[PDB]
């Protein structure tokens, strides 16, 4: 049922080994736990902002 990949540097585009990573995620069955960075800026004082 299994055949072995054989990769050599002589291979052209498409025949080369292409490492693939997929980031599958689950939607809102719980409080949010994983996400991106919320950017923060410098602090200011003595002026309404």
């Amino acid at each position: 049922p299994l055949q072995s990949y054989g990769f050599q540097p002589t291979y052209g585009v498409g025949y080369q080994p292409y490492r693939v990573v997929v980031l599958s995620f689950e939607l809102l069955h719980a409080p949010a736990t994983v996400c991106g960075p919320k950017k923060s800026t410098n602090l200011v004082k003595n002026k309404c902002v």
Partner: protein, 48 residues
């Protein structure tokens, strides 16, 4: 609360034999847990 699990803790000394003492104290929050699973009952754990 809506999947969020909240535990409030308070450390305090006491000198009494068996029952709950009389007095006033408040429990500050310790940590909130974003678990998101349902609970129907609970059970305590001991040291053998």
């Amino acid at each position: 609360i809506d999947g969020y699990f909240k535990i409030y803790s308070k450390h305090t000394p006491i000198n009494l034999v068996r029952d709950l003492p009389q007095g006033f104290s408040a429990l500050e929050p310790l940590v909130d847990l974003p678990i998101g699973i349902n609970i129907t009952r609970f059970q305590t754990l001991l040291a053998l």
